[PDB]
C-alpha cells in the first residue's frame, strides 16, 4: 500500500533471481478467473492453479470458499494446507475493496470493532445484512450463513452490534447551445448552496413552470433571438416565459452577452417582464456572481 | 523497425543539452518547445517511439529539470515545462513523479488564474491519478481535487476534457476512501456541467464515464442520484455512435466491472466503451484480450438478460465485432419455459456440458425453477460443489429477472422486491407452496425452510418479520337487433 515500501521490495526482488509479482487489484468481489490465478501464484499455490481453473473460480466463489469445497472439489486433501490457504484468504479479505457490495460501509464498522473482523464483511453483505439489520441477527444465523466459525468473534460481533446500534425552487430557461454552459453552472452552483433547481434535459412544460418556486431565465447571448417577435408561441422557451408571467413567480434574469429586446416587437406578456433588473454574469468571478444572485434571492 | 528512434535519440541528446545549457528564459522555453514538438511528432507515428523518448528523458534526469523549472519564478518557462510534462508522464515517469516529483504539482494547483497553467496541471493531475491509489489519496488530501473542480467551473474545452478524464481516472484508481472524499466534495455535481455541455461529445462521454464509475460504488449511489447527473447518461449513450469515437488491458479490466455493475447507466457506459475498444482491436489482429479478461461472458449475459434497447444494441454490436455468436434473448416467462428454453439458457450461461444431462432428465421451466442441490448432485451429475454454487448463482440471477404473472396471484414478487431486490428469487417457491399476501401472516420458519427453499436463515427471519409487521339486478337492460 506504500510506494516506498513497494519500490524497496521490488528492487530487492529484482536484485535476486525472482520474478516481481504484479500488484493485485483490491476489488476482490469483481475479480475474474485471471485475477484469482494471479493471486494463486502470488501466494505460492501454483499446484492448485489448474484445479481452480477447472472449477472456474472467480472473485465471489473464492471470497465465499468453504472448507469442504477445498477438501473435495479443489483436491486440497491436507488439513494443514487448507489452514494455510484460509490464512492467506483471511489476509486477502482484510485488504479488499468491498465498495461494489458494501452499502452501509459495514467494513469500517467491523474494522472499528477489530482489524481482523473485517474479513467477515463479504459474508455479512452476501447474507444481505447491513448496519441497520445487525441489531436483530442471531448467533445461529451468523454461524450458518456469514461463515464466522469462531464463536468468540460471533459473540463479540453480536454484543457490539446490540450495544452500538441501540416543487423546484428555481427553474432554468436556456438556449440549446449558447445557454447550456451557463444553465449548467447556475444549477450546479445553486444546488451547492442548498437551492433545488430543476433543469429539463408542452403539457409537462406548463406544470414544470407552475411548480417552480422562482423562475430564473438565462439571458445568454442571443437567448431571446428565437423568442423575438414570437407572437405565435411556437418556441417552447416562449411557452416557459408566458407560463412564468402568468404565474408571476420571482424573476431574476442573469445578463450575459445580450440586451433587453424592444417591447414593441415583443408581445405584451413579455413586455411586462422586461422591466425586471438583471445581474451580469462574470466568468472571472462565477461563485461571487452566484452569491450575489442568492443574496438578491430568498 | 526503430530507425526513427535510432536517429531521434541523438536529437533528444542535443535538445536536452541545449535546454540545460540555456540560462535565459526564452532559450529554455524554445528548447522545451522543441522537445515537446519532437514528442508530438513521435506520437503521431508511435507508442514505442514515445516510450524510448521518455526512457531517455528519465535516465538523463530531464524530469527533475522540469520540476525545478516549475519551481522557477518565470511563468512562461513554467508553461513550456508543463507542456512537456503533460506528454512525458508515462508509467515509469509517473512512478518517478510519484516518488520524488510530488508536492511540486500542488504548488501549481495553488495557481488558478492562467488558462494554460490550468490545462497543463489538469493533464498532469490526470496522469498522476492514473498512477496508483496512494498518489490519488495524497492528491485528494491536497488541493488537487479542488483545483480540478475549479477548472471544471471554467469554460476552456481542452481544460474541461482533461479535468473529466482526470476525474474518471481518479475514480477508477482511487478506492473506497477516494470516492467517498470525492462525493463529500460534490464530485458528481461538478461533473454534471461537463456532461451537459453540447459543444464537445468527448467531454460528455468522459464525464458520463466518471459518473458511471462513481455509481458502481453503490454505497454512495443515493448521493450520486441526489446530484442528478446520472440521468443524462442514457440519452447521451443512445445519441452517440461508437464508430466515430473509435475511429478518432488494465483499462478494459477496470471497465468490465461497469458491465457487471447491474446499474443501467454504468452498464451502458461499459458497453459503449467495450464496443469501441473491440472495434479498435478488431481493426488490428489482436482480439484475444477480451477473451483473456472474460468480458465475452459478461457481454453474453448482458444480451440474454437485457432490458434496455440501447444497452442490448451496444452489446450485440460488440459481440458481432468479435468472433462470438450473439445469444438470443430469453423469454422472461420462466415458469412457462419448455425444454428448448432451458437448453438455450444453458448455452447462454455457458453450461453446454450439462445440456445433454438436462435434456435426458427433460427439465422444463418448473423443474428448473424448483431445482435443488441434491438433484444437481445426483441426477444431473454436477459433482463439483463450486460448479453447483455457480449454477445456483446463475439460477438466482434468472429468478430475479422472471415473469411470475402466470403463477403469482397477489403480486407477491413486488412485495418481496420491496423488502429487498434479492428477495424476489423466492417468489416461485412461495407461490408453489400456495402462499400469497394474505397467507404470509401465519407462515412459520420451519415451513419456509422446508417448502419455500429459503436456505438462508437471515432471509427467512427478514421475510417473517416483515410479513408479520406489514400484513397486520342489472341497472340497464339492452334491446338490440342481431346485426
Ligand atoms: O498510456 P500510458 O503510458 O499510461 O500514459 C499516457 C501518456 O502519454 C501521453 N500522450 C499520449 C498520446 C498522445 C500524446 S501527444 C501524449 C499522455 O500525456 C499520458 O501522460
UniProtKB/Swiss-Prot annotation, chain B:
Enumerate the residues binding NAD(+) 2: 481-482
Q: What is its EC number?
A: 3.2.2.6, 3.2.2.-
Protein transport listed as a keyword? no
Q: What does the tissue specificity note say?
A: Predominantly expressed in brain, kidney and liver. Expressed at lower level in placenta.
- Effect in UniProt of substituting residue 87 to A: In WQH to A mutant: Increased NAD(+)-binding to ARM repeats, leading to decreased NAD(+) hydrolase activity
Q: How does it assemble?
A: Homooctamer; forms an octameric ring via SAM domains. Interacts with TICAM1/TRIF and thereby interferes with TICAM1/TRIF function. Interacts with MAPK10/JNK3 and SDC2 (via cytoplasmic domain).
Effect seen on changing residue 458 to D = Slightly reduced ability to form an octameric ring and promote axonal degeneration following injury
GO-annotated cellular components: axon; cell surface; cytoplasm; cytosol; dendrite; extrinsic component of synaptic membrane; glutamatergic synapse; microtubule
Question: What is the activity regulation entry?
Answer: Autoinhibited: in the inactive state, the enzymatic TIR domain is held apart by the autoinhibiting ARM repeats. NAD(+)-binding to ARM repeats maintains an inactive state by promoting interaction between ARM repeats and the TIR domain, thereby facilitating inhibition of the enzymatic TIR domain. Following activation, possibly by nicotinamide mononucleotide (NMN), auto-inhibitory interactions are released, allowing self-association of the TIR domains and subsequent activation of the NAD(+) hydrolase (NADase) activity. Self-association of TIR domains is facilitated by the octamer of SAM domains.
What chemistry does it catalyse, as a reaction equation?
Answer: NAD(+) + H2O = ADP-D-ribose + nicotinamide + H(+); NAD(+) = cyclic ADP-beta-D-ribose + nicotinamide + H(+); NADP(+) + H2O = ADP-D-ribose 2'-phosphate + nicotinamide + H(+)
* Result after altering residue 378 to A: Does not affect phosphorylation level
SAM domain segment(s): 337-401, 411-472
Q: Chief localization class? A: cytoplasm
An example GO BP is: protein localization to mitochondrion
Q: What is the effect of changing residue 336 to A?
A: Does not affect phosphorylation level
Name assigned to this protein: NAD(+) hydrolase SARM1
| Entry's localization field | Cytoplasm; Cell projection, Axon; Cell projection, Dendrite; Synapse
Q: How does the record comment on the protein's domains?
A: The TIR domain mediates NAD(+) hydrolase (NADase) activity. Self-association of TIR domains is required for NADase activity. The ARM repeats inhibit the NAD(+) hydrolase (NADase) activity by binding to NAD(+): NAD(+)-binding to ARM repeats facilitates inhibition of the TIR domain NADase through their domain interface. In contrast to classical ARM repeats, the last helix of ARM 6 does not fold back to interact with the first two helices, but instead turns towards the N-terminus of SARM1. As a result, the two following motifs ARM 7 and ARM 8 reverse their directions and lie perpendicularly. Moreover, ARM repeats interact with different domains not only within each protomer but also of the adjacent ones.
State how changing residue 130 to E affects the protein, per the record.
Answer: In RRK to E mutant: Strongly reduced NAD(+)-binding to ARM repeats, leading to enhanced NAD(+) hydrolase activity and constitutive axonal degeneration in absence of injury
Amino acids binding NAD(+) 1 = 43, 47, 86-94, 127-130
Q: Secreted among the record's keywords?
A: no
Describe the effect of residue 480 to A. Answer: Loss of NAD(+) hydrolase activity
Q: What does this protein do?
A: NAD(+) hydrolase, which plays a key role in axonal degeneration following injury by regulating NAD(+) metabolism. Acts as a negative regulator of MYD88- and TRIF-dependent toll-like receptor signaling pathway by promoting Wallerian degeneration, an injury-induced form of programmed subcellular death which involves degeneration of an axon distal to the injury site.
